[PDB]
PDB file of C-alpha atoms in Angstrom:
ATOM      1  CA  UNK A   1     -25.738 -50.754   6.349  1.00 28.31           C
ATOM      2  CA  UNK A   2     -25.212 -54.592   5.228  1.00 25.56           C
ATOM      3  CA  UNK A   3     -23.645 -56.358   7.520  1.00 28.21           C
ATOM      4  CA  UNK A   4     -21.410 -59.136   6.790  1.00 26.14           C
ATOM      5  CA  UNK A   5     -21.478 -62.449   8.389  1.00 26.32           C
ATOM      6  CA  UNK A   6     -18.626 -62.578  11.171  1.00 29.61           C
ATOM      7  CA  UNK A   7     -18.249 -58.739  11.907  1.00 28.80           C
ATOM      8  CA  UNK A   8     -22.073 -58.880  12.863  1.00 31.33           C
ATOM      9  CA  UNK A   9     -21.507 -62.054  14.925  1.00 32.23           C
ATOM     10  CA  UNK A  10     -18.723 -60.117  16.539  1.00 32.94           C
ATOM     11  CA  UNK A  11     -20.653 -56.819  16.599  1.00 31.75           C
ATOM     12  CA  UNK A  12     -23.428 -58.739  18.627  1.00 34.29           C
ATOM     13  CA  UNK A  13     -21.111 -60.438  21.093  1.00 36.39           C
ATOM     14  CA  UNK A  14     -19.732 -57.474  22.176  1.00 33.46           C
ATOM     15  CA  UNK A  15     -23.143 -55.717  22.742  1.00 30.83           C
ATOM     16  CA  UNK A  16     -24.334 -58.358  25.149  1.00 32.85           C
ATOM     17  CA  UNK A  17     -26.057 -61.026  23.128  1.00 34.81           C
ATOM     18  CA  UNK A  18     -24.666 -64.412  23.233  1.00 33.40           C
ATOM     19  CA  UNK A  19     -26.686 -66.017  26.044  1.00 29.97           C
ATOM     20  CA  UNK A  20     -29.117 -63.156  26.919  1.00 30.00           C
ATOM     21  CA  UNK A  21     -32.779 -64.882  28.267  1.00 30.78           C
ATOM     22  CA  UNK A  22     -30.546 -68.045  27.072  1.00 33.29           C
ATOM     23  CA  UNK A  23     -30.523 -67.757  23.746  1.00 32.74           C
ATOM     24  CA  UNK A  24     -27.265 -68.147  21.936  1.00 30.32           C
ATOM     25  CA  UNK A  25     -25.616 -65.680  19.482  1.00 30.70           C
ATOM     26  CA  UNK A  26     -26.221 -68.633  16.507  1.00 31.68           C
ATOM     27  CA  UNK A  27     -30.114 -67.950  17.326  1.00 29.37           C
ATOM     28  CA  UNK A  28     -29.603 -64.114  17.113  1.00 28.12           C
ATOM     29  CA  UNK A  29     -27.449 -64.340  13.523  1.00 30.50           C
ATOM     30  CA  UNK A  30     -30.225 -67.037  12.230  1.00 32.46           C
ATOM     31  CA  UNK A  31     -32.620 -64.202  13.098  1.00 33.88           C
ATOM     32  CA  UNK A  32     -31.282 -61.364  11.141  1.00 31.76           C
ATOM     33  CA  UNK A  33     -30.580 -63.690   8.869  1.00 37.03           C
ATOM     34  CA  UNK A  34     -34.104 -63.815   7.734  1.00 39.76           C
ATOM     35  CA  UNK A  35     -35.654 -60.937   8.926  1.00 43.25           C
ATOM     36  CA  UNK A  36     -33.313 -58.510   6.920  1.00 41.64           C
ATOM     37  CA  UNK A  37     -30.113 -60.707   5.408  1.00 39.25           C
ATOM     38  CA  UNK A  38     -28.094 -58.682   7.822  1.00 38.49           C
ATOM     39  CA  UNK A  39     -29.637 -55.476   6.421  1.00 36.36           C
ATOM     40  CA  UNK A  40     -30.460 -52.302   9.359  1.00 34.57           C
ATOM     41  CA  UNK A  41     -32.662 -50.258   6.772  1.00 30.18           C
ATOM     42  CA  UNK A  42     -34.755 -53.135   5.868  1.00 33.90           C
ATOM     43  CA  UNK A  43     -38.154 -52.169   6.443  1.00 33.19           C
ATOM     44  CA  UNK A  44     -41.572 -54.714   5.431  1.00 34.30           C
ATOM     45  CA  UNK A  45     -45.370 -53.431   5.278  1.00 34.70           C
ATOM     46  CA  UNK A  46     -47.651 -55.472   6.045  1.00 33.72           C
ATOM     47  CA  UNK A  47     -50.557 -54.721   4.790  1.00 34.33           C
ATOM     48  CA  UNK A  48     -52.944 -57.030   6.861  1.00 32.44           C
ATOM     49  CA  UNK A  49     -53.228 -55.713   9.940  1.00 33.79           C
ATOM     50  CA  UNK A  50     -50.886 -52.299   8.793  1.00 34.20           C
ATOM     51  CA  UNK A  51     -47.644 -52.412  10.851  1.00 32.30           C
ATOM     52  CA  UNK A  52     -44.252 -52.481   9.634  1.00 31.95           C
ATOM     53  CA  UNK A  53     -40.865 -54.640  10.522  1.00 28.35           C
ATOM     54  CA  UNK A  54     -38.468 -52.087  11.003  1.00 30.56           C
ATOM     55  CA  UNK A  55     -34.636 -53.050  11.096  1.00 30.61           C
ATOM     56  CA  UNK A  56     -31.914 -55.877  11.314  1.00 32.59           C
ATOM     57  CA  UNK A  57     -34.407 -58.008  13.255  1.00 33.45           C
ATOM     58  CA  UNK A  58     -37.682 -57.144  11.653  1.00 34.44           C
ATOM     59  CA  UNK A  59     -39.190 -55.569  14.892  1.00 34.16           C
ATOM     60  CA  UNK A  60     -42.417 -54.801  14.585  1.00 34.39           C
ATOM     61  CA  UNK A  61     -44.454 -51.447  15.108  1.00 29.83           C
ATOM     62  CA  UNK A  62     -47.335 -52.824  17.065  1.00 32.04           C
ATOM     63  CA  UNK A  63     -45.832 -53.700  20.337  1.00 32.15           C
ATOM     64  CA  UNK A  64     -42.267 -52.492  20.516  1.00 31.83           C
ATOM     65  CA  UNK A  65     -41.520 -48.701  18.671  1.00 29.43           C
ATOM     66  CA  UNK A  66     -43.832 -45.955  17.297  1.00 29.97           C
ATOM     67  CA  UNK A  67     -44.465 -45.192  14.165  1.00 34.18           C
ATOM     68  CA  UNK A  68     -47.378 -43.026  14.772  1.00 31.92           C
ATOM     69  CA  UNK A  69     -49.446 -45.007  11.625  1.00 34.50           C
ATOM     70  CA  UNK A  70     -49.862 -48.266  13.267  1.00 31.09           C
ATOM     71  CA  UNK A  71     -53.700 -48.782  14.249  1.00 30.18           C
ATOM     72  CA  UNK A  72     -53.975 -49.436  18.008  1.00 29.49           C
ATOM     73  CA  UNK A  73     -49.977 -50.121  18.667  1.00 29.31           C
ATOM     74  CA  UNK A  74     -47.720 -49.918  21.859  1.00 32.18           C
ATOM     75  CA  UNK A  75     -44.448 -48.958  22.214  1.00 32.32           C
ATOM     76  CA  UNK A  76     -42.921 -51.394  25.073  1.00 28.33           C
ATOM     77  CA  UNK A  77     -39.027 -50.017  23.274  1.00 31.14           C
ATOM     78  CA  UNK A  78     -39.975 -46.551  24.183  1.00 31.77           C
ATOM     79  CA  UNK A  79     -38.532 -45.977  20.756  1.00 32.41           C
ATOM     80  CA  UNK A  80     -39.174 -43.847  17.619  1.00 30.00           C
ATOM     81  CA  UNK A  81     -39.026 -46.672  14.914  1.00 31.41           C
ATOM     82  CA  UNK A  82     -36.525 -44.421  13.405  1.00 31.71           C
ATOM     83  CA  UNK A  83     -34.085 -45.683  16.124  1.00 33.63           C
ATOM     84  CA  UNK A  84     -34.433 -48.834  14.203  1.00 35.37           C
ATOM     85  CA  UNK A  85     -33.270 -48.126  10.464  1.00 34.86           C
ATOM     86  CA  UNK A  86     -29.847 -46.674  12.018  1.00 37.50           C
ATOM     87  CA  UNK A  87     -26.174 -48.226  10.800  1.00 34.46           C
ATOM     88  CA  UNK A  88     -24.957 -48.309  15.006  1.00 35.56           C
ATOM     89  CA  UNK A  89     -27.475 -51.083  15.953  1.00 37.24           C
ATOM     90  CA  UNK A  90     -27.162 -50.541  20.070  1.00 35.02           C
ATOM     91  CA  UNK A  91     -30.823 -49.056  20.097  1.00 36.82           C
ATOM     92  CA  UNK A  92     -31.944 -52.477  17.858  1.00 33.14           C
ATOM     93  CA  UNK A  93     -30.136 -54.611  20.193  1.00 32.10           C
ATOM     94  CA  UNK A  94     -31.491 -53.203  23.409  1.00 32.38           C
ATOM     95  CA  UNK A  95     -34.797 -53.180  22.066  1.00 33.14           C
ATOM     96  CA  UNK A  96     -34.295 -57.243  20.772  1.00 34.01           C
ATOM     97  CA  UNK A  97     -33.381 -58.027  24.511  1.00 32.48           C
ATOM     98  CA  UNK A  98     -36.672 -56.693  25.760  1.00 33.50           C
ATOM     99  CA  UNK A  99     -38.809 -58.445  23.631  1.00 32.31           C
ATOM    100  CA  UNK A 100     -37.463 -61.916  24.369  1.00 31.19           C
ATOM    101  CA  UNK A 101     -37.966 -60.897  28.203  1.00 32.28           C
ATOM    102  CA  UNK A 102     -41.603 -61.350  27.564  1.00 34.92           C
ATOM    103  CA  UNK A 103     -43.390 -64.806  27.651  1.00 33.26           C
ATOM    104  CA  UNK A 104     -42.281 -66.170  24.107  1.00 33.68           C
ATOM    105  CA  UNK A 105     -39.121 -64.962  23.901  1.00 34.32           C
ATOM    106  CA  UNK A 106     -37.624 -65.961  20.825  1.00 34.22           C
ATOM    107  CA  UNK A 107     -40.686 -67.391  19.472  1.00 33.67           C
ATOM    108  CA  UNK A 108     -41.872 -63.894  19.315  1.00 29.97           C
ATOM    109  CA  UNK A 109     -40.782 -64.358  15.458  1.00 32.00           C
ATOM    110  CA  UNK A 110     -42.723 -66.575  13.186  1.00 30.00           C
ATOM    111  CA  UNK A 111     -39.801 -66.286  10.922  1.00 32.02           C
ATOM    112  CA  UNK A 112     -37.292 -67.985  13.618  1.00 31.15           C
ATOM    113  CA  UNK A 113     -40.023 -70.966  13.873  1.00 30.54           C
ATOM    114  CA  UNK A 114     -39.949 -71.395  10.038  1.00 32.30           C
ATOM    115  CA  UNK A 115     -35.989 -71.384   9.661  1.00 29.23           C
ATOM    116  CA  UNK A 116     -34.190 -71.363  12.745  1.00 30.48           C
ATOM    117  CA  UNK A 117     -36.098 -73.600  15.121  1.00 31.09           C
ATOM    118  CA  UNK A 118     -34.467 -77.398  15.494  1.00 28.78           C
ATOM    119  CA  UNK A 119     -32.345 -76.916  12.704  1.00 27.72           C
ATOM    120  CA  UNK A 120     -28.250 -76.530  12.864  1.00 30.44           C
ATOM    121  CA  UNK A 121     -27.513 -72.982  13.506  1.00 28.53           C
ATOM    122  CA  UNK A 122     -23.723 -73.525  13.698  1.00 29.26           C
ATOM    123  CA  UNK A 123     -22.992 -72.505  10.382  1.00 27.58           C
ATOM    124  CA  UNK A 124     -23.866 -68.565  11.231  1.00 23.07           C
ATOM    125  CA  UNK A 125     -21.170 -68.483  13.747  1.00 24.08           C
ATOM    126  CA  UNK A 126     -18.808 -70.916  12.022  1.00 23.15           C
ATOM    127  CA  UNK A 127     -15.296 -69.063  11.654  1.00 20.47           C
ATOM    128  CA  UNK A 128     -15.772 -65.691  13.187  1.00 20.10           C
ATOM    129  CA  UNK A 129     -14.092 -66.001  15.755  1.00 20.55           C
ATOM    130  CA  UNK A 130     -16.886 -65.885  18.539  1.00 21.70           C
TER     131      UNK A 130
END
């Protein structure tokens, strides 16, 4: 499914997000943003070190769902990457909130850094209703 803008700002709120580990919902909509322009089936190889970003927020199969190909990976999700790729994105947003309880938390994404980081989120949220 491809989201649009304000019903996944909506969708989010609703599901716990604004706030959680203090980051705001503009923070979570920047991330999807880039990881998948809103997209759940989005899915990116890459080929260096041979994991894959699976879903709306590009979560990767090293440390957070199985994928049974990944070299060496974890599963902290407990979570068939499968789970991931679905249109109902509770098991992407429970799995998002445990991997900003670790250390880095939002950081955890280069891709937040690069385009979210300092810069004026606002205009994610802006008319939605949130």
């Amino acid at each position: 499914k491809v989201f649009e803008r304000c019903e996944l700002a909506r969708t989010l709120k609703r599901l716990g997000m604004d706030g959680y580990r203090g980051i705001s919902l503009a923070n979570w909509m920047c991330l999807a943003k880039w990881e998948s322009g809103y997209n759940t089936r989005a899915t990116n190889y890459n080929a260096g070190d041979r994991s894959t970003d699976y879903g709306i927020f590009g979560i990767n199969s090293r440390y957070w769902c199985n994928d049974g190909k990944t070299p060496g990976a974890v599963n902290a999700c407990h979570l068939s990457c499968s789970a991931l790729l679905q249109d109902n994105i509770a098991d992407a947003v429970a799995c998002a909130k445990r991997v900003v309880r670790d250390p880095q938390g939002i950081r955890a994404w280069v891709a937040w850094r690069n385009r979210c980081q300092n810069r004026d989120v606002r205009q994610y949220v802006q008319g939605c209703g949130v």
